[PDB]
Amino acid sequence: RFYGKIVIKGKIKAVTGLHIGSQRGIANPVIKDPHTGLPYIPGSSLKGRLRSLFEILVNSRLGEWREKYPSLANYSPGSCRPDNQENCGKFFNRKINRGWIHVCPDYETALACPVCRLFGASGKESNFPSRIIVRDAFLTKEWEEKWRAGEAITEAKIEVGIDRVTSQANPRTNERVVAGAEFEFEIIYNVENTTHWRDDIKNLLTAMALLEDSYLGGSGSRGYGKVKFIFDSFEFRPLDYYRTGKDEDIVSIDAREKSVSDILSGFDSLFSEVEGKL
Amino acid sequence: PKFIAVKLIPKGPFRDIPRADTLFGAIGNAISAIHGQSAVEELVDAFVGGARISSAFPYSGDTYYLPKPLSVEPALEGILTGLDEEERYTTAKRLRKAKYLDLKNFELALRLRPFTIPEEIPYARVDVPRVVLDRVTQDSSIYFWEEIRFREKSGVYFLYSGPREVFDGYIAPAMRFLGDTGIGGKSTWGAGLFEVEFHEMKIDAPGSEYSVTLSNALPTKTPVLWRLLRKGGWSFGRRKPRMTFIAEGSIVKNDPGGMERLELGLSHEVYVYGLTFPLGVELPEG
Amino acid sequence: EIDELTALGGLLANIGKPVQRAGLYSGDHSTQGARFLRDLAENTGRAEYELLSLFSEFHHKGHMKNDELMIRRIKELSPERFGLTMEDVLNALWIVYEADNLASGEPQASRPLYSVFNPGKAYPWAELDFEKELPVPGDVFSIRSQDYRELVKRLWEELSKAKLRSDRLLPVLEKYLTFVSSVTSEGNIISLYDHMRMTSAIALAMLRAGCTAEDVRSGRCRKEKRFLLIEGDFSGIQDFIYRVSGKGTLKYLRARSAYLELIGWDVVLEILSRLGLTRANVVFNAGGHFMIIAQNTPDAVKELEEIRAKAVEWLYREFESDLYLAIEWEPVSGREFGREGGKNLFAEARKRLKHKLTVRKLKRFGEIKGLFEHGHTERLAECPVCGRELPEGKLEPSASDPETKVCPTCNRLVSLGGNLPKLLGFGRTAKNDAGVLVEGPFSGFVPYLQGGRPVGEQILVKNTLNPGEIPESAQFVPYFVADYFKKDPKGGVATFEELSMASTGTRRLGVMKGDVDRLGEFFSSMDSPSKLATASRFMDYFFKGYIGAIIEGKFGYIIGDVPSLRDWPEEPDIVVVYAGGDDFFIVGAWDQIFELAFRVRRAFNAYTGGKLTLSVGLGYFDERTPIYRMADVVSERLDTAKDEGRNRVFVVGRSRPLDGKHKLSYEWNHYEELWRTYAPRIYAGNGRLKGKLESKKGLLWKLLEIRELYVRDPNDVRWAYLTAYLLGRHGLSDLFPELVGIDTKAVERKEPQPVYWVDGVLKIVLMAVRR
Numbered sequence A: 001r002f003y004g005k006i007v008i009k010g011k012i013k014a015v016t017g018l019h020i021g022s023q024r025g026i027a028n029p030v031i032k033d034p035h036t037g038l039p040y041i042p043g044s045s046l047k048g049r050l051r052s053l054f055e056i057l058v059n060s061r062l063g064e065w066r067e068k069y070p071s072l073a074n075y076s077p078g079s080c081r082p083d084n085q086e087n088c089g090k091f092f093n094r095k096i097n098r099g100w101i102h103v104c105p106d107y108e109t110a111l112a113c114p115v116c117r118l119f120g121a122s123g124k125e126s127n128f129p130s131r132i133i134v135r136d137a138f139l140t141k142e143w144e145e146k147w148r149a150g151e152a153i154t155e156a157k158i159e160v161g162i163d164r165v166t167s168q169a170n171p172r173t174n175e176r177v178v179a180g181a182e183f184e185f186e187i188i189y190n191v192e193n194t195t196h197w198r199d200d201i202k203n204l205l206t207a208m209a210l211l212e213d214s215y216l217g218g219s220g221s222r223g224y225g226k227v228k229f230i231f232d233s234f235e236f237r238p239l240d241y242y243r244t245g246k247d248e249d250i251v252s253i254d255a256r257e258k259s260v261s262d263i264l265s266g267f268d269s270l271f272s273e274v275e276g277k278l
Numbered sequence B: 001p002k003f004i005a006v007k008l009i010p011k012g013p014f015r016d017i018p019r020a021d022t023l024f025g026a027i028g029n030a031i032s033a034i035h036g037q038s039a040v041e042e043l044v045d046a047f048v049g050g051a052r053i054s055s056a057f058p059y060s061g062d063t064y065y066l067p068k069p070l071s072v073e074p075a076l077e078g079i080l081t082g083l084d085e086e087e088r089y090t091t092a093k094r095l096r097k098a099k100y101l102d103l104k105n106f107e108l109a110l111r112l113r114p115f116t117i118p119e120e121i122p123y124a125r126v127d128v129p130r131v132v133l134d135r136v137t138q139d140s141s142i143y144f145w146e147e148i149r150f151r152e153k154s155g156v157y158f159l160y161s162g163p164r165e166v167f168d169g170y171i172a173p174a175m176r177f178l179g180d181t182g183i184g185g186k187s188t189w190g191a192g193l194f195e196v197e198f199h200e201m202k203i204d205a206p207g208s209e210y211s212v213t214l215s216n217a218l219p220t221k222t223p224v225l226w227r228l229l230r231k232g233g234w235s236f237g238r239r240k241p242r243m244t245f246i247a248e249g250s251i252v253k254n255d256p257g258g259m260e261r262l263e264l265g266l267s268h269e270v271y272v273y274g275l276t277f278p279l280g281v282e283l284p285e286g
Numbered sequence C: 001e002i003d004e005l006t007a008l009g010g011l012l013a014n015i016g017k018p019v020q021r022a023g024l025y026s027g028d029h030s031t032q033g034a035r036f037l038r039d040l041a042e043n044t045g046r047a048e049y050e051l052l053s054l055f056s057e058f059h060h061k062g063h064m065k066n067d068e069l070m071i072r073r074i075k076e077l078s079p080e081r082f083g084l085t086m087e088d089v090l091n092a093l094w095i096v097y098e099a100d101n102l103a104s105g106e107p108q109a110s111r112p113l114y115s116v117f118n119p120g121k122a123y124p125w126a127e128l129d130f131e132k133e134l135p136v137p138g139d140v141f142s143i144r145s146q147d148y149r150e151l152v153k154r155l156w157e158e159l160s161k162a163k164l165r166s167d168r169l170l171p172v173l174e175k176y177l178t179f180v181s182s183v184t185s186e187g188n189i190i191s192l193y194d195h196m197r198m199t200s201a202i203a204l205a206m207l208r209a210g211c212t213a214e215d216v217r218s219g220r221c222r223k224e225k226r227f228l229l230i231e232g233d234f235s236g237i238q239d240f241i242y243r244v245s246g247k248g249t250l251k252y253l254r255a256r257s258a259y260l261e262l263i264g265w266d267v268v269l270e271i272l273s274r275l276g277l278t279r280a281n282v283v284f285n286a287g288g289h290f291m292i293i294a295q296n297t298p299d300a301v302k303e304l305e306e307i308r309a310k311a312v313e314w315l316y317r318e319f320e321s322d323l324y325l326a327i328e329w330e331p332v333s334g335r336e337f338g339r340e341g342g343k344n345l346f347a348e349a350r351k352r353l354k355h356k357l358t359v360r361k362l363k364r365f366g367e368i369k370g371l372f373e374h375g376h377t378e379r380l381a382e383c384p385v386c387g388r389e390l391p392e393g394k395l396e397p398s399a400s401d402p403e404t405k406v407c408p409t410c411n412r413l414v415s416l417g418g419n420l421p422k423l424l425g426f427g428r429t430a431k432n433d434a435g436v437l438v439e440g441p442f443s444g445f446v447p448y449l450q451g452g453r454p455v456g457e458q459i460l461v462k463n464t465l466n467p468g469e470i471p472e473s474a475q476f477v478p479y480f481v482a483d484y485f486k487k488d489p490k491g492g493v494a495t496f497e498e499l500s501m502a503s504t505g506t507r508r509l510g511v512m513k514g515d516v517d518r519l520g521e522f523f524s525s526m527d528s529p530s531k532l533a534t535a536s537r538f539m540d541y542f543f544k545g546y547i548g549a550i551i552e553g554k555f556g557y558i559i560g561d562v563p564s565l566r567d568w569p570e571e572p573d574i575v576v577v578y579a580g581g582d583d584f585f586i587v588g589a590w591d592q593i594f595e596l597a598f599r600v601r602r603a604f605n606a607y608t609g610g611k612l613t614l615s616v617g618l619g620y621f622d623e624r625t626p627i628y629r630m631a632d633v634v635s636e637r638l639d640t641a642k643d644e645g646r647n648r649v650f651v652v653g654r655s656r657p658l659d660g661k662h663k664l665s666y667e668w669n670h671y672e673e674l675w676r677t678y679a680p681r682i683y684a685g686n687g688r689l690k691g692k693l694e695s696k697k698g699l700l701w702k703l704l705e706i707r708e709l710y711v712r713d714p715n716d717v718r719w720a721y722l723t724a725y726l727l728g729r730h731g732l733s734d735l736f737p738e739l740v741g742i743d744t745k746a747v748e749r750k751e752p753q754p755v756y757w758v759d760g761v762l763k764i765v766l767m768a769v770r771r
């Protein structure tokens, strides 16, 4: 059943050079729109990084969350990698090709898991669709104009590999986005159930709060991530909006707030009308 | 006549240009969310009773593209009588490979007039690679994924003939639901999303006994000149059976079409869109 | 019977010319071919050759005066030895004579076969063996009389050791009389084999149509529609061979292409074996498109319609609307074959027939009647490898990975891919026998292996013209196929991973897809069926036999200097997926797919008289790419080269502005001249650079970034001095002395700057290097 669509708009700030490769004139190119030649952040590199951070978060808290989320009682912390048997006792239970991901095996279990209820599950005779839509982040109008003014939007950085004894240098190049860029993101949560959506928003903000202290794509451990979420507005888009079309959606106002001044700083305050209309 | 051109200004890639079977199923799922089951059965009774929607076609900045009729190829040497034969042959071959036409050149090919093909297709079919990363060891497993990436002003649109009370009651509230969910493809990666605008298209078409189909056909009687399209989608995880449609621009004579209802083991019955969208066409002798 | 003896007459009535040009007997070669078939019957030969001398003497109507001189010679001969009637043996000599005029389309100076692509050039007399000799048309030189006697010696040897039969004499006269001219004149471009192959075809169609000896004398068979031009064409080939998912690494693709050619031969040979026609009635059969001369009888139009009704219903059950065979026919007359006056009638009745093919492809399965009939079948399932949905449980676990559940028609092709190196052809037998791997629409096909005995009434034999281990009663049908393949360490076919690892530099997979340009205009120029039968064999032989000998490193005087990254190996890693008659789709190592496209182009430039062109798309792909995607990209890179100039190559994917003034594809002589200037100064051969540019790729990648400033705005001149500074501080002012100064004449002529075309030469070398 459909009740509305909580819509999350804002900006992604690449505080440090962000690299999301393609492997196809720089030797390691970041991906680009083929018609403009501008870089972008996909919706699939953003979502699998919000999920990979959140699955390790749940993996540490399997025992402490057995009675808020069921079907975390059927998982043991760890991977099923050594014993090559899927949907076993351990957590990261589905092998895709060579990688192990937590994907719950049935609809009846993915409605209880906090990962798969928010991010989706494949299953056999299951097909649990996700509840969030993560759009491709494109450069802000202010940064498309710097592309018009003749600037460089993607630098090229040279590293080197050096022997520990004889200091033989062995360099390579990596294209990465110029630090400081502003993207425009969009996440549209789908209010299916009217009870557990607060736990699905507060888990999505936790995945973003871990992303501001981890990296987004690329090399990262050598300092190629360092992302920052700059929220603009949260909107509700009620069920009455879609039938009659009149513009009475509920709009939160957060021009300059963080991902941690938004999770509990104003959570009782910013969602006051949304939690009232349900 | 006068049709209502529903434009779909994209906000990312698509998975494919939508056809009419996968627009009507998406309009069906959009109505059941905001209205319910009793209006979906009323929607299906409105399409059988009255006017029906067409397939989706590209545009590129006030150049509404439409499909090339298949009525031109048995005429395509009589269309080009007044040309010199060393350039008439390569004109005749590129005229046949063409898939779409402008809003103006469509009205010439309906009258067996000389026409020209467009120079540029408003999109591309790129192959973005994704990856599946292991959660402990970060091991990669590349698969490939293809898309439809539109240009700066380009988009996609479909047409609607019908009564206006059915449009703003059913088609118009459904297209704003679908602006925030997808039309096919990985909607969770932001694919099938768009912004909807409503305009007016008017097509000059010759009154005749024959007609071209601007949507998938699923004909009752055998058509005149056609082109087979063979696809069957998915419905709540249930795999639809493949159905011999007819592609757009194919020529029928006094055919209304008709939807086939399916079972698929669900609770509700699944209708598959196969109504035709007739625009009048002129033919040669077969 | 009169049936075989009429076809043997016209296939030997013109025989004797090679003994005129040699100088065995006194002249008027009709008298000579009588004595040559007389002397053949005596020593090591049956008496049937004596009766066949009547057809080689009483043609051209120079001897059969007032009809009575024929009778006094043949009254001595007894036709009761063969069951022939005194009047029925008189009947066939008249049929051969009218079929002799309805083929040439019409003597002094012995002239060698002239070239059908340019009549100003001519062919030296050769042996059709496809080995070590590319017949390139040179300047006109008359064949010596010493050289025609050696033609007679081998022909005397082969006719005594061959069975006197319609199918056993055709590869005899093909290997030896292909490059012998029929009528010696100024610019004869019709062969003697092909003139006899189309005299025997028209003589047999007259006999089935029921015209007698007084019908030929009265002029009644001409100006009356008694023949019938059959033509067929497979629609949907490119979405049948290549449209499979990421399974079956190229052993299976080479089996989809060999199974396409078996469906084409199963339909053609069924038309011949049911109307009573020999293989000479096939005008051509080249890449899923055939043409047959037959009779116009009610016992054949009815009998062809049952062949089309059965074959289309077979194609619809097996491959669900992915391959269609449009078969049509058109009644023609005697004068319709030849040029009558100033208008070409044969090219007009061919373009009436070609219009009926065009409107039949738009009615793609009209002859099913349950085509748009819906229905519900339980357990419908999709076979993973080739997008075909089957009833649940029909797919049988595969032989590759037994967890997967493929359709059973793909396990017949994986098993076929394991026997294509060890294969000498096929045998055509009934549907319901054992040993059959794949069935066609009318028959089942048993693979005739290397060491073994064939089975079937009709034996298809690949890439040779000698029936060695074949029974004497079995019908011999030769065909040809381009069948080069890189082997693995075993005796098989390599992989999309194995071909991609023997390439210099980056490990990509290279794909070319080409076809001859404006070829329909070339075959429309042919005005007579013997002239079409010559131009459609010679074009067929380049993409069947001589494209193998290009990969074999031959013909170095003809090819010359081509853009090569590495020097040419003894065994190229090339897998010819398909080569049809104009079209060819070849995959291999991306360094040798690049060189071969210039090596096929130069040889095709000289196999013709420089009149026909090619166009090649080239892609460089990941190994783990689905093959239906590597086809759909290179088919777009071919069509991008095809709507621009039709003598031009697409080399590498390239950035260019959308102003319409820049085109992505190079012309052949432009790129091959850009390589002789820019490559010997920066590239040394075998994946290494020159002196003073080693460890200086950072020059070259930034040189492409300066090329990107031309792409962002061609009107900005900022790229001109940045080139001069970057070449300057490295001391390389000698390298590239025209990328520093803007060409004003190019802005005058409205053609791009030389910084734009340098991308196709640099980016190949940067890919050649480790990068």
Ligand SMILES: [Zn+2]
Pocket (backbone or CB within 6 Å): A102, A103, A104, A109, A110, A113, A114, A115, A116, A117, A121
């Ligand atoms: Zn889960």
Ligand SMILES: [Zn+2]
Pocket (backbone or CB within 6 Å): C383, C384, C385, C386, C387, C388, C406, C407, C409, C410
């Ligand atoms: Zn299959």
